[PDB]
Amino acid sequence: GSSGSSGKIDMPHRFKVYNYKSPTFCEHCGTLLWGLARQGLKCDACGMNVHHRCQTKVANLCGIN
């Protein structure tokens, strides 16, 4: 909590590396990901799969959208 008032807020995508065996699709470049242990990244907040770079290209609104 806090003392005051807030308005508009934006949060980044909690993208965390994941080691799995499945065909993942990027929500930005719309392509496949070829990896071994760092198979792209997956947001543990909203739940999205994007590349390491394609991640910094997505909006900084996790949960709001």
Residues of this chain that interact with Zn ion (CB under 5 A) are 13, 26, 29, 43, 45-46, 51, 54, 62
Query: Closest approach of Cβ 7 to Zn ion, in Å?
Result: 21
Return phi, psi of residue 30, to 5°: 55, 55
Residue 8 vs 25, nearer CB to Zn ion = 25
Residue 26 vs 39, nearer CB to Zn ion = 26
Q: Which long-range contacts (CB under 8 A, 24 or more apart) does 52-57 make?
A: 54/26, 54/27, 54/28, 54/29, 55/13, 55/15, 55/28, 57/28
Query: Closest approach of Cβ 39 to Zn ion, in Å?
Result: 12
